């Protein structure tokens, strides 16, 4: 019943196959008003009308897998996700008429082909046709359409549609295929902000997360080549050509986790902050620079996130990799020697048990990086680190003083915030990487007379101004729990055109989001499952709406 209808003239459907399509809308996730969340619109390519159930399930699978990656995972409940069941005449594999005219070119790139049927504006379909109709009818802002997409505007062909990518944070097109490909089309000045990825390739979920990293998070392809000119250096969130560690944009992250600048290939002038990143090789996670930049980017699209605390680590402090000149060699051999050295020193996460009674007289370092998201409030965070016996008690020296140290760190305001992909931006041009950013290092000299026992480990906390624990020595390896969303009428019926998905949260999380007052035209009644610790996989939060 819930749908949008398009009018596709010859510029969008020159063969008449999709002149007046009805597109069923499915809500996969709507946790808050569209005006407070990042709205993601996903359409299917090469799914026939009888395959739309497969399409919906494919979107849920790809989306749920994407939300397992940081930094998306920290925002998982602040996305609203809609699946638009665009029906193709042919399956993709059969090779006939499809909704989006996607072809795979000789570089293995999936491209919307305007020339396939001579639909001269086919690759403008998201921001000129689908987007405006969705934002008028489905999106809570209900912005009325401004221009007829089948006519030529007066003046700019593009400006009337710029608003679309402020109300829809990302368009994704899932192709019904096992073929391994992926493409991201980011050029907001000319209306383009979508990506294309396959439903069933061997790495479908990894590709989706990678292309989403290009599209939403603004991250550059870490496999690309060349020396970045000054303007492109300023423009790039996660690539550099600056060889001098004292000058490179992400200098504050050097030596934190696997952040060690290196060439992305032998002899390359293109540098990455970590050789192991999903933006270079889809088998990896997002590196710390990409997590920081992506977290900052998404914070611009919601209103209630004001701090980023990267997962802290503890390392034996030997002096290795502690000053800029330790980072001057940019070869992969240096990157891996660095990561090996880190593992030899690690005392946190799954290396907590490497602590031992030979640690007396050694130094240990608690390290993380903190980004203030506020442009108004400076922050003061207190770090505490101590030696903990296996029974939970605090270890002492031989005079009974606790083996504990504390240090407060000042995090300056993000004064440069308006230069970093704010709402309405067509591109990112220049930002000060260090604005609002503070690398925090707390070094503790374990006394020579420490009364260490077998099974001791390093404990720590990062505390806000009120003593709330923002991260601790359990954060990195804590258990995550799956939460399922369901949309129901007051009589218990499942609401049509919903397909509530799952995401994960840390065990014990209390969800505290204000439900959207409407779902389609249905009025919100009540929700069951918010504000209570999530302690079981398959926990269901049920949003009840009026029939
Ligand atoms: Pr009614
Ligand atoms: Zn990266």
Q: Rounded to the nearest whole angstrom, what is the distance from the C-alpha of residue 2 to the centroid of ligand 1?
A: 15
Q: Report every protein residue that has its C-beta within 5 angstroms of ion ligand 2.
A: 238, 277, 279, 287, 290
Q: Rounded to the nearest whole angstrom, what is the distance from the C-alpha of residue 286 to the centroid of ligand 2?
A: 5
DSSP run (H or E) holding 371: strand 363-372
Q: What is the token pair recorded at 442? A: 């707390």
Nearest ligand, measured from the Cα of 546:
1
Q: What is the resolution of this structure in A?
A: 1.5
Q: What is the token pair recorded at 512? A: 């505290």
Q: Output DSSP code: residue 197.
A: E
Q: Rounded to the nearest whole angstrom, what is the distance from the C-alpha of residue 212 to the centroid of ligand 2?
A: 13
Indicate the CATH number for domain 3-215: 3.40.390
How many CA within 13 A on the CB side of residue 280?
20
How many CA within 13 A on the CB side of residue 215?
26
Q: Rounded to the nearest whole angstrom, what is the distance from the C-alpha of residue 87 to the centroid of ligand 2?
A: 36
Q: Could you tell me which residues are beta bridge partners of residue 540?
A: 484
CB burial class (10 A; 0-12, 13-18, 19+) of residue 326? middle
Nearest ligand, measured from the Cα of 271:
2
Q: Rounded to the nearest whole angstrom, what is the distance from the C-alpha of residue 507 to the centroid of ligand 2?
A: 27
Q: Rounded to the nearest whole angstrom, what is the distance from the C-alpha of residue 30 to the centroid of ligand 1?
A: 20
Nearest ligand, measured from the Cα of 523:
1
Q: Rounded to the nearest whole angstrom, what is the distance from the C-alpha of residue 118 to the centroid of ligand 2?
A: 38
Nearest ligand, measured from the Cα of 287:
2
Closest to 367 measured CA to CA, from 411, 315, 406:
315
Closest to 407 measured CA to CA, from 383, 439, 438, 437:
383
- Residue found under tokens 């920290």: 74
Q: Which residues of the chain does CATH 3.40.390 include?
A: 3-215
Nearest ligand, measured from the Cα of 489:
1
CA distances, 471 to each of 313, 378, 503, 509 (Å)? 10, 19, 21, 13
Nearest ligand, measured from the Cα of 236:
2
Cα dihedral sign for 265, 267, 272, 275?
positive
User: Which phi-psi region, left, alpha or beta, contains residue 75 (left: φ > 0; alpha: ψ -120 to 50)?
Assistant: alpha
SS3 state of residue 44? strand
Distance CA 83, CA 60 (A): 9
Q: Rounded to the nearest whole angstrom, what is the distance from the C-alpha of residue 213 to the centroid of ligand 2?
A: 9
Q: Rounded to the nearest whole angstrom, what is the distance from the C-alpha of residue 238 to the centroid of ligand 2?
A: 6
Q: Rounded to the nearest whole angstrom, what is the distance from the C-alpha of residue 140 to the centroid of ligand 1?
A: 17
Q: How many CB atoms lie within 10 A of CB 405?
A: 17
Q: Rounded to the nearest whole angstrom, what is the distance from the C-alpha of residue 130 to the centroid of ligand 1?
A: 27
Q: What is the token pair recorded at 331? A: 């070869």
Q: What is the DSSP string of 107-137?
A: TS-EEE-HHHHT-TTGGGHIIIIIHHHHHHH
H helices present in 265-353, as ranges: 288-299, 332-345
SS3 state of residue 358? helix
Distance CA 14, CA 17 (A): 8
CB burial class (10 A; 0-12, 13-18, 19+) of residue 68? middle
Residue 195 phi, psi dihedral angles, 5° rounding = -135, 165
Residue 477 phi, psi dihedral angles, 5° rounding = -105, 15
DSSP run (H or E) holding 38: strand 38-45
Q: Rounded to the nearest whole angstrom, what is the distance from the C-alpha of residue 517 to the centroid of ligand 1?
A: 14
Distance CA 12, CA 114 (A): 8
Q: Rounded to the nearest whole angstrom, what is the distance from the C-alpha of residue 206 to the centroid of ligand 2?
A: 14
Distance CA 23, CA 276 (A): 40
Q: Rounded to the nearest whole angstrom, what is the distance from the C-alpha of residue 380 to the centroid of ligand 2?
A: 28
Q: Which residues of the chain does CATH 3.10.20.320 include?
A: 484-545
Nearest ligand, measured from the Cα of 294:
2
* Contact between residue 386 and residue 402 where contact means Cβ atoms under 8 Å apart: yes
Residues 6 or more apart whose Cβ sits within 8 Å of residue 216: 38, 169, 170, 294, 297, 298
Closest to 495 measured CA to CA, from 452, 453, 534, 547:
547
CATH architecture of 484-545: Roll (3.10)
Count, residues in the chain: 547
Looking only at the bridges linking them, the beta strands covering 170-175 and 192-198 are: parallel
CB burial class (10 A; 0-12, 13-18, 19+) of residue 516? buried
Q: Rounded to the nearest whole angstrom, what is the distance from the C-alpha of residue 306 to the centroid of ligand 2?
A: 22
Distance CA 231, CA 234 (A): 5
Determination method here?
A: X-ray
Per the annotation, binding residues for Zn(2+) are 210, 214, 221-222, 277, 287, 290
Task: Report, in this order, helix, strand and coil percent for the chain, each rounded to 5.
Answer: 20, 25, 50
**Number of DSSP helices (H) and strands (E) in the chain, helices first:** 9, 25
SS3 state of residue 393? coil
Q: At what angle do helices 52-66 and 204-215 cross, to 10 degrees?
A: 70
Cα dihedral sign for 397, 398, 401, 407?
negative
Nearest ligand, measured from the Cα of 522:
1
Q: Output DSSP code: residue 60.
A: H
Q: Rounded to the nearest whole angstrom, what is the distance from the C-alpha of residue 273 to the centroid of ligand 2?
A: 7
Q: What is the token pair recorded at 268? A: 């390359």
* Contact between residue 484 and residue 540 where contact means Cβ atoms under 8 Å apart: yes
Per the annotation, binding residues are 210, 214, 221-222, 277, 287, 290
Q: Could you tell me which residues are beta bridge partners of residue 498?
A: 27
Rounded (10°) CA dihedral 127, 232, 219, 269: 140
Distance CA 425, CA 442 (A): 38
Q: Rounded to the nearest whole angstrom, what is the distance from the C-alpha of residue 522 to the centroid of ligand 1?
A: 7
């Amino acid at each position: 019943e819930q749908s949008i209808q398009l009018t596709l003239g010859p510029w969008y459907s020159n063969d008449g196959k999709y002149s007046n399509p009805t597109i069923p809308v499915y809500t996969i996730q709507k946790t808050r008003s569209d005006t407070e969340n990042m709205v993601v619109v996903v359409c299917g390519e090469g799914y026939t009308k009888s395959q739309q159930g497969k399409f919906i399930n494919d979107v849920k699978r790809l989306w749920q897998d994407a939300m397992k990656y940081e930094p998306y995972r920290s925002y998982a409940d602040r996305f609203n996700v809609y699946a638009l069941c665009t029906a193709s005449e042919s399956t993709f594999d059969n090779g006939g008429s499809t909704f989006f005219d996607v072809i795979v070119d000789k570089y293995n790139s999936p491209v919307i082909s305007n020339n396939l049927h001579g639909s001269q504006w086919k690759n403008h379909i998201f921001e000129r046709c689908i987007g405006p109709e969705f934002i008028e009818k489905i999106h809570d802002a209900h912005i009325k359409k401004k221009c007829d997409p089948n006519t030529i505007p007066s003046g700019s062909e593009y400006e009337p549609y710029y608003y679309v990518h402020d109300y829809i944070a990302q368009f994704a097109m899932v192709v019904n295929t096992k073929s391994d490909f992926g493409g991201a089309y980011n050029n907001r000045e000319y209306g383009f902000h979508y990506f294309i990825s396959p439903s069933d390739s061997y790495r479908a979920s990894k590709t989706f997360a990678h292309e989403f990293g290009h599209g939403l998070l603004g991250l550059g392809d870490e496999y690309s080549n060349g020396y970045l000119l000054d303007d492109k250096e300023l423009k790039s969130l996660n690539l550099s050509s600056v060889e001098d560690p004292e000058k490179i944009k992400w200098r504050q992250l050097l030596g934190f986790r696997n952040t060690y600048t290196c060439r992305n290939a032998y002899g390359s002038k293109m540098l990455v902050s970590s050789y192991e990143c999903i933006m270079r090789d889809t088998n990896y996670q997002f590196c710390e620079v990409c997590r920081l930049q992506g977290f900052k980017r998404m914070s611009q699209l919601v209103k209630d996130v004001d701090l980023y605390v990267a997962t802290p680590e503890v390392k034996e402090y030997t002096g290795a990799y502690s000053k800029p000149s330790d980072f001057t060699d940019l070869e992969t051999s240096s990157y891996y020697n660095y990561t090996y050295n880190r593992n030899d020193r690690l005392l946190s996460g799954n290396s907590k048990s490497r602590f031992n009674t030979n640690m007396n007289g050694k130094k240990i370092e608690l390290r993380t990086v903190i980004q203030n998201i506020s442009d108004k409030n400076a922050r003061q965070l207190k770090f505490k680190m101590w030696i903990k016996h296996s029974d939970g008690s605090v270890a002492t020296d031989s005079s009974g003083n606790p083996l504990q140290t504390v240090q407060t760190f000042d995090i300056p305001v993000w004064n440069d915030k308006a230069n970093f992909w704010p709402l309405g931006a067509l591109d990112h041009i220049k930002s000060d990487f260090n604005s609002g950013l503070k690398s925090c290092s707390l070094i503790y000299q374990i006394p020579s007379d420490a009364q260490l026992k077998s099974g001791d480990t390093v404990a720590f906390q990062v505390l806000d101004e009120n003593g709330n624990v923002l991260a601790d020595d359990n954060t990195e390896t804590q258990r995550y729990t799956t939460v399922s969303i369901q949309y129901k009428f007051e009589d218990g019926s499942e609401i049509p055109n919903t397909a509530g998905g799952t995401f994960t949260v840390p065990y014990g999380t209390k969800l505290d989001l204000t439900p959207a007052k409407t779902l389609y035209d249905y009025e919100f009644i009540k929700v069951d499952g918010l504000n209570k610790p999530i302690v079981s996989d398959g926990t269901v939060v049920t949003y009840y709406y009026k029939n």
